[PDB]
């Protein structure tokens, strides 16, 4: 039941490591999961619905990890505080590069994927802005850009830059250098008076 | 001859305003250009080759404008200097949103589009890094991140953030606010000691 479902999901994750969703059939997923094709269809209406589940699970994992960090004060300087938050995404999405990458490609063709991504990006930007505003309220950060516009561009930079690194794009920051790169830009732009 | 070609190109640009390349046929392009379908094929081998030409023209327009700025010293402060350079992209790509957007969608399916984009991104990042290094050499900017890794993330942020704004994505910075947003992040991260 649920473990034929977890098997379709594990199969899809495993196959997405080697080729795109376009190069994977429902039959590929069925065979890997040790089930027939009509049995696959009891669990998922399509291969696109398989990706959506996987992406949904990854995005919620990142989100829960961010909630956990938030509910636990966390004892260090401002630069390290930002580093820890960015690290959630670096580690969560870096542990699921194939799914995370397939989600981006699916955004153009799947309104549900686009909607799911858009929902979490809004949540993450809103929370980023709320922290910047808190930092501004305690007098730790100057009131420069609107917090929400600042949060939007910084989260969009991370989306694109971690994606480039994880996909091995030309150009891209080496994955062993990208965390430090993003933390620098976030801290100087959030605390920089100019 | 060349003006049947400019007509196929103008037609493609005009139609890409209303729908994606997937929703446009060679016949659509032929009819708009006032030529038959086999005549289209004398000018371009495909509709994908039409997009490549358009994108190539836009990317070279941005590049030439950046070269022009570079060869002309340009008389103002550092913040305004960065603003002028970012403005090249804001204005060039903002004057060609449909082509510029279709190029991004094509990167996944067209190795020539991916290669063209990748080439210019490398050039633009290299030039960004050379300016940061010059700024560092005159003692105007601190030696923080490697200049090339800094330039990479900043150009990737602009790519993604101007794209989001021009495509009206949720989320996105309003197009009337995005220039100021990006200039802030570039100037604070390039000049910020922390
Ligand atoms: C292949 C791929 C790789 C990475 C992404 N991606 N999408 C992202 C969206 C937001 C994001 N955000 C961050 O890294 C930092 O977010 C923080 C930090 C501190 C407090 C709050 C937040 C949201 C990283 C992201 N990375 C998307 C696709
Ligand atoms: C739809 C769409 C919209 C915009 C882009 N895009 N791609 C970009 C790549 C680089 C880029 N760069 C900049 O804005 C700033 O670049 C500077 C500034 C000063 C000196 C040198 C450079 C390269 C903007 C870009 N915008 C791509 C697609």
Curated annotation (Swiss-Prot), chains A, B:
Residue ranges annotated for the HTH tetR-type domain, each copy included: 2-62
Keyword Zinc: no
UniProt keyword Transcription regulation present: yes
DNA-binding region in chain numbering: 25-44
Annotated GO MF terms: DNA-binding transcription factor activity; transcription cis-regulatory region binding
InterPro entries in alphabetical order: EthR_C, Homeodomain-like_sf, HTH-type_TetR-like_transc_reg, HTH_TetR, Tet_transcr_reg_TetR-rel_C_sf
UniProt entry keywords in alphabetical sequence: DNA-binding, Repressor, Transcription, Transcription regulation
Subunit structure, as described in the record: Homodimer.
Function field: Involved in the repression of the monooxygenase EthA which is responsible of the formation of the active metabolite of ethionamide (ETH).
PANTHER family reported in the protein's UniProt record: HTH-TYPE TRANSCRIPTIONAL REGULATOR ETHR, HTH-TYPE TRANSCRIPTIONAL REGULATOR RUTR
This protein's name: HTH-type transcriptional regulator EthR
Annotated gene: ethR
């Amino acid at each position: 039941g649920d473990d034929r479902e977890l098997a379709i999901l594990a199969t899809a994750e495993n196959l997405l490591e080697d080729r795109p969703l376009a190069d994977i059939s429902v039959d590929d997923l069925a065979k890997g999961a040790g089930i027939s094709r009509p049995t696959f269809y009891f669990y998922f209406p399509s291969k696109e619905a398989v990706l959506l589940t996987l992406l949904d699970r990854v995005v919620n994992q990142a989100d829960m990890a961010l909630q956990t960090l938030a509910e636990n004060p966390a004892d260090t300087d401002r630069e390290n505080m930002w580093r820890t938050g960015i690290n959630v995404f670096f580690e969560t999405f870096g542990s699921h590069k194939a799914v995370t990458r397939a989600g981006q490609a699916a955004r153009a063709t799947s309104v549900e994927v686009a909607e799911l991504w858009s929902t979490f990006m809004q949540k993450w930007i809103a929370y980023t802005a709320a922290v910047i505003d808190a930092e501004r309220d305690r007098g730790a950060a100057p009131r420069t850009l609107p917090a929400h516009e600042l949060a939007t561009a910084l989260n969009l930079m991370n989306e694109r830059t971690l994606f480039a690194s994880f996909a091995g794009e030309q150009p891209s920051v080496p994955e062993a250098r990208v965390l430090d790169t993003l933390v620098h830009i976030w801290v100087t732009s959030i605390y920089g008076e100019n």
